[PDB]
Design a binder for this molecule. Structure first.
Ligand SMILES: [Mg+2]
Ligand SMILES: [Zn+2]
Ligand SMILES: [Zn+2]
Lengths: 302, 43, 80, 97, 221, 242, 359
């Protein structure tokens, strides 16, 4: 989510700023005091090809492309010097000893890679030479996913000595292997991403952002997730945001009759079609908005 | 530091270095479901 | 940080009516809030604020996804 | 013929009969180590919500509500007492094994 | 000069004063791209060049001061109402750094002003709220499907001879009247062997006192 | 996986039983033998067909899990809420278009001919003909008083690969089911032949559901107003005894 | 003369200025009293005497398999030195700009975005601030001016150059998607009243999809940005384009089928018996559209075929069509050519009816 409101002024390590956040359609009293983190993803509770079994989930590729759970991931690189022994600068091969083999030193400008360039594995991001003629104490970018240099400064440490501070950013969309969760504790790994025309759709054109297995419910008994979809389905059509705080009086029978008041079915299920074949399922499918949240466990980092 | 302090525990010589090993040519990743793969296949 | 340009789910151009929809909301809410302080509006327990007819008058269809993302999206300008 | 919750349980795909009963009918007595809720809140009281030497079954972990109906505050506390044991024993099922 | 510029360029005060200077055009809207641009921006923001700064011992006395001096006495509730808050906040920040007289009272006055302003901004940030009302009442719905304790008659557990009920006999009634026989009474073992889809489970029967469950209220309590 | 945007190790859900794994965020190690001696040992000793039968319990480890379990029930179920559980020639051919086995012969079928789910299953079990006769998990004496069982669903019989009657569920096709379909195929045709049939029957079940549909809703967990009063009466009788 | 589809309904989505809140907000935001230059258009089409493979393939192509245009930023367009705003990052603004629905005539138009905030209040950047810097001067707008591109803190800037029109299909990136689904139904299958509690778990149709074979369909799709005075011209064009796309892809397979004597990696022929022939057609980067069309029409041509299937595997990026039939190789290839010709004729008739219906 918005992990901090002053993020551009900070140089943090392993911090993710998710661009888009939504208030839940069924919110709680906790959202009066903290900013909500997540999105009101449309979720279909159905079997679709077997790619959603055992905590697996099927994501819409179009939902990913539009920025769903997308954000920027940050890393820092702090490099200190020795007093008058070490210095920042581009090493030269003629007089410097033990340069890194097969390393790129050509992106450096005055010892630091300039802000705005893409650094890949095997690039030197900070040039650092110690004088004895010189020993190459440089720092190489050892990550398999490329970054972009976001901010470079040379602040003064506690001992009034210069050190190098680098901020690297990563454009992180949702991708296969990333972890999402509902507010009822049902966490899943994105297993398959389908295009728009391959996702299932209802008679009215509604398609899900996520397809979760119905088998995640019966043993886990996360009934607040199913009630949230039922309530939020009528919230969206009515144009309202309600409160779903714990221990508030609810009646699932009356919340289900609220669906039929808005033109839907009692169970919230709709006639659905297979996006690949164009054929309708014989069973109506429970599809509706369920607030989902992306857990900061990235497959690119693991 | 002592010579015999290197031996005893789970982080010691015998259990960390002799009964186990850091190895090369190995990969790790998050696992995911795929119904088009056979049971004896890994994607 | 803003209402999305298109609906996250189906891609309908939600954003072209976002700005208008935002400001109309405030006026509508100013009609119904009463004496309750603004930050206690989600606590009033007597408010019934329905935006259905406003979004319909914008021309946006009756799609669950589009109205969900229009209604629920947080605006970074209002918190920073 | 049509209920997906029943078909997942009846065929053996997922869930059990007590899972359906808990969701739909009632949770019943919370048992920890084959016992009811022990009076741990000051000598004869199980919680601040029940008097001392209370006789009703609700005071000792009998949850009358189902998950669909929702639990009251004392029923959620007794449910959290039972559910905390599952988390503790799962952590112990790794180290002790 | 270079070490002092690197020291001061990392000061948040410098960024705030540079922003205030950019707003009213005292410095270019882009970050300096040349040493001359950096020197000019430093001279404008800090009020003196790096060489004349360390020469001496004052630093905060001549930091930029916004050009437009709006009237902040309309911040007494009485473009505007947001320009005033910003400019008065920067001016009060500069007064704080200079330990100006009567700062502590003006700070509380501006705190009240900006608390009212934040009340407005919290009004702008509201997305709506709805309460499902019970039609019978006119306020938030209190109808629930929670368990309600009720002392049942003792005949629901015991018969007129003091014995408990055993609801182990299942009574099935034919759905269609032409079906013969009209009723069948079977136990759990023989349900699959004697009952088909032509029958519906009507009631349970006690295997001790032989009473239908719905006819248990006919027992003398 | 040629897609450059995939960083995960992917495997079939029926292979998870070997590792006690699931897809909530588990990480697994993988190394490829480069030595000739280790490559020979990998494929002759350590292949996962060698651990289809448990060393601990002497029973099968793999089977259908959660989607080909309920999917096999739906496919082999006698009656659908819309009449007999049959499908035309085009949709029967579509169940085999993913199994990656040799397609059966549908030449003796008009486009309007109707095939039931046990005929389609038998078209796959003819390759490994086994014999099986047990009551399915579907039939429970607990449910019998309050629901009408179809007499053709509660007696699962397979004769030389022909599903004569009954439904396929956890008892016949589930993972860990001793004496089940894949345990019997292993005992007569080898554990590698059993693994091939677990995949093939999984694709039949998943291709059936992709036209039949399967969902869970909030209304699946909601009692009727009359049933809620009956539950309250039962709990009041418990508290009366207390 | 086969009238495959008739009864087209075209209806734009318009702003209701009768509502006073909307009217006042639009007036004192954008000085807006008329409709926007580009409006979404809902198009509902009735097809008769056609399989749902063809209609659903048309729908899929109109959704995310038709060439479309978006706005993108050329590398180096985002000016880091000039954009002093710390919150409007290039990823955010690029994602916003990619998804503005455009109705462009050529790929030559180049735009720029030069926003300065000389005020003490946060300033919002809209689409009306996108100035055209290259290409012939626009006589009609290609996007609406009411999109919130971003916002600048007091004293900040945002300079973006080299904003250009990019072409692609929505199957690769969703910013090239064209149509959103608004309706799909079969008019020749009866339906239950599903508001009743004994039918609400079922889809509603009185025939199972495992047995039904509908030939009469209603399909409704919404196009997101169409000029108001030329709506009928745009929709018609879109429909015709979709048909051509399908025809082209089908014709690609016709190039394989007429080279079956020449060894070809995309076509493998087996003689399983002395009388049974097997054909396997593997096409890279093909989808369920063409696979389902091919399977359906081969099945129509050979009703007593031994097998036909069209497996499209997600992790293989391949469509593999398997055909097993009791003819020889030459007879099988002749039948397959007949099936492909039937597909081509169907979509040519669709083009003709699109021209006939929309004036
Ligand atoms: Mg796990
Ligand atoms: Zn939408
Ligand atoms: Zn009795």
């Amino acid at each position: 989510g918005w992990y901090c409101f002053s993020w551009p002024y900070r140089v943090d390590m392993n911090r993710f700023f998710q661009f888009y956040n939504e208030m839940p359609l069924v919110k709680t009293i906790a959202h009066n005091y903290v900013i909500p983190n997540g999105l009101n993803t449309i979720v279909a509770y159905m079997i679709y090809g077997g790619y959603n079994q055992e905590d697996s989930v099927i994501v819409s590729q179009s939902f990913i492309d539009r920025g769903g759970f997308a954000g920027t991931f940050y890393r820092e690189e702090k490099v200190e010097l020795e007093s008058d022994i070490e210095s920042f600068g581009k090493p030269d091969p003629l007089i410097t000893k033990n340069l890194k083999p097969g390393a790129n030193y050509e992106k450096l400008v005055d010892g630091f890679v300039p802000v705005g360039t893409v650094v890949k594995k095997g690039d030197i991001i900070i040039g650092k030479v110690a004088k004895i003629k010189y020993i190459d104490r440089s720092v190489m970018y050892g990550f398999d996913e490329p970054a972009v240099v976001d901010a470079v400064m040379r602040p003064h440490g506690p001992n009034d000595e210069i050190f190098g501070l680098m901020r690297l950013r990563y454009e992180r969309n949702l991708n296969i292997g990333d972890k999402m969760s509902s507010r009822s504790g049902n966490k899943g790994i994105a297993a398959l991403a389908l295009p728009t025309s391959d996702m299932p759709f209802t008679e009215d054109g509604l398609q899900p952002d996520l397809i979760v297995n119905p088998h995640s419910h019966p043993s886990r008994m996360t009934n607040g997730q199913m009630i949230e979809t039922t309530v939020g389905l009528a919230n969206a059509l009515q144009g309202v945001v309600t409160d779903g705080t714990a221990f508030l009086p609810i009646n699932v029978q009356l919340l289900s009759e609220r669906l039929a008041q808005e033109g839907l079915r009692f169970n919230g299920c709709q006639k659905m079609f297979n996006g690949q074949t164009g054929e309708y399922f014989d069973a109506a499918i429970f599809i509706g908005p369920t607030y989902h949240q992306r857990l900061q466990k990235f497959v690119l980092d693991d | 530091p002592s010579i015999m302090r290197r031996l005893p525990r789970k982080e010691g010589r015998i259990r960390k270095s002799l009964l186990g090993s850091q190895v090369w040519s190995i990969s790790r990743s998050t696992i995911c479901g795929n119904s088009d793969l056979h049971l004896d296949e890994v994607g | 940080m803003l209402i999305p340009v298109v609906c996250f789910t189906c891609g309908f151009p939600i954003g072209t009516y976002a700005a208008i929809f935002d400001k109309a909301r405030t006026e509508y809410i100013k009609t119904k809030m009463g004496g309750t302080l603004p930050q206690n509006i989600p606590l009033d327990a007597s408010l019934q604020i329905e935006l259905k007819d406003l979004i319909t008058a914008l021309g946006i269809p009756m799609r669950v996804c589009c109205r969900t993302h229009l209604i629920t999206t947080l605006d970074y300008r209002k918190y920073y | 013929e049509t209920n997906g919750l029943f078909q997942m349980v009846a065929t053996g795909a997922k869930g059990s009969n007590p899972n359906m009963i808990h969701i739909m009918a009632g949770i019943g007595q919370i048992e920890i180590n084959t016992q009811r809720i022990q009076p741990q809140f000051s000598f004869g009281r199980t919680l601040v919500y029940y008097p001392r030497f209370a006789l009703e079954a609700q005071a000792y972990g009998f949850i009358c509500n189902s998950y669909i109906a929702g639990l009251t505050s004392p029923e959620f506390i007794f449910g959290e007492m039972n559910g905390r044991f599952d988390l503790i024993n799962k952590a112990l099922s790794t180290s002790s094994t | 000069t270079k070490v002092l510029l690197t020291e001061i360029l990392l000061d948040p005060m410098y960024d705030y004063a540079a922003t205030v200077a950019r707003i009213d055009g005292s410095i270019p809207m882009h970050k300096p791209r040349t040493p001359k641009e950096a020197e000019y921006e430093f001279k404008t923001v800090i009020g003196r060049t790096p060489a004349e700064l360390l020469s001496q011992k004052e630093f905060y006395d001549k930091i930029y001061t916004s050009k437009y001096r709006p009237d902040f006495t309309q911040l007494t509730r009485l473009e505007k109402t947001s320009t005033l808050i910003y400019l008065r906040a920067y001016e009060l920040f500069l007064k704080y750094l200079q330990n100006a007289p009567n700062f502590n009272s003006e700070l509380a006055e501006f705190k009240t002003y900006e608390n009212a302003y934040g009340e407005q901004k919290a009004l702008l940030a509201q997305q709506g709220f709805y309460n499902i009302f019970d039609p019978n009442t006119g306020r938030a719905d209190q109808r629930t499907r929670l368990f309600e304790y009720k002392r049942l008659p003792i005949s629901t557990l015991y018969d007129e001879r003091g014995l408990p009920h055993k609801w182990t006999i299942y009574v099935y009634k034919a759905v269609d009247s032409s079906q013969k026989p009209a009723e069948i009474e079977v136990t759990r073992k023989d349900v699959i062997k004697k009952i088909d889809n032509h029958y519906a489970l009507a009631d349970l029967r006690c295997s001790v006192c032989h009473v239908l469950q719905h006819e248990v209220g006919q027992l003398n309590i | 996986l040629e897609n450059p945007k995939i960083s995960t190790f992917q495997m079939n859900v029926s292979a998870c039983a070997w590792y006690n794994a699931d897809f909530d965020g588990d990480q697994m190690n993988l190394w490829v033998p480069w030595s000739v001696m280790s490559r020979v040992e990998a494929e002759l000793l350590c292949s996962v067909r060698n651990w289809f039968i448990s060393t601990k319990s002497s029973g099968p480890v793999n089977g259908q899990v959660q989607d080909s379990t309920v999917g096999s029930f739906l496919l082999t179920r006698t009656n659908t809420p819309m009449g007999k559980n049959v499908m035309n020639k085009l949709h029967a051919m579509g169940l085999f278009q993913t199994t990656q086995t040799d397609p059966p012969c549908f030449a003796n079928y008009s486009p309007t001919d109707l095939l039931d789910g046990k005929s389609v299953v038998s078209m796959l079990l003819r390759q490994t003909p086994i014999n099986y006769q047990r009551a399915p998990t579907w039939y429970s004496e607990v449910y019998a008083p309050y629901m009408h069982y179809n007499k053709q669903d509660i007696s699962t019989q397979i004769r030389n690969g022909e599903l004569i009657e009954g439904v396929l569920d956890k008892k016949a096709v589930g993972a860990g089911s001793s004496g089940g379909i894949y345990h019997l195929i292993s005992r007569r045709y080898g554990p590698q032949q059993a693994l091939k049939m677990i995949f093939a029957t999984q694709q039949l079940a998943l291709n059936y559901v992709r036209n039949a549909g399967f969902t869970v809703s909030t209304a699946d967990m909601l009692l009727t107003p009359e049933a809620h009063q009956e539950v309250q009466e039962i709990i009041n009788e418990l508290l009366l005894e207390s | 003369m086969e009238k495959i589809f008739q009864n087209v309904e075209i209806k734009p989505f318009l702003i209701d200025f009768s509502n006073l809140f909307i009217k006042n907000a639009a007036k004192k935001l954008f000085q807006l009293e008329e409709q926007l230059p580009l409006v979404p258009v809902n198009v509902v089409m009735d097809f008769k005497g056609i399989s749902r493979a063809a209609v659903h393939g048309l729908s899929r192509v109109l959704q995310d398999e038709i060439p479309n245009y978006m706005l993108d930023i050329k590398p180096g367009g985002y000016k880091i030195e000039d954009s002093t705003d710390l919150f409007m990052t290039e990823q955010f603004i690029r994602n916003r700009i990619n998804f503005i629905p455009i109705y462009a005539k050529n790929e030559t138009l180049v735009f720029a975005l030069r926003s300065l905030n000389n005020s003490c209040e946060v300033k919002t950047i809209y689409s009306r601030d996108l100035i055209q810097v290259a290409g012939p001067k626009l006589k009609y707008p290609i996007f609406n001016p009411t999109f919130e591109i971003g916002f600048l803190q007091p004293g900040k800037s945002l300079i973006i150059e080299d904003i250009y029109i990019k072409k692609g299909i929505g199957r690769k990136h969703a910013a090239f998607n064209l149509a959103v689904k608004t309706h799909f139904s079969h008019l020749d299958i009866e339906q239950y009243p599903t508001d009743k509690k004994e039918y609400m778990a079922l889809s509603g149709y009185k025939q199972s999809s495992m047995t039904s074979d509908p030939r009469h369909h209603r399909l409704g799709l919404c196009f997101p940005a169409v000029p108001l005075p030329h709506i009928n011209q745009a929709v018609r064009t879109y429909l015709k384009n979709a048909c051509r796309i399908i025809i082209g892809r089908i014709q690609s397979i016709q190039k394989i089928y007429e080279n079956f004597e020449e060894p070809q990696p995309e076509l493998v022929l087996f003689s399983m018996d002395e009388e049974k022939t097997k054909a396997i057609i593997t096409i890279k980067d093909e989808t369920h559209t063409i696979g389902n069309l091919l399977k359906t029409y081969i099945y129509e041509m050979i009703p007593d075929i031994s097998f036909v299937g069209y497996q499209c595997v997600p992790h293989k990026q391949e469509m593999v069509l398997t055909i097993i039939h009791k003819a020889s190789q030459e007879d099988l290839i002749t039948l397959l050519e007949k099936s492909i010709q039937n597909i081509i004729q169907t979509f040519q008739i669709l083009e003709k009816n699109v021209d006939e219906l929309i004036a």
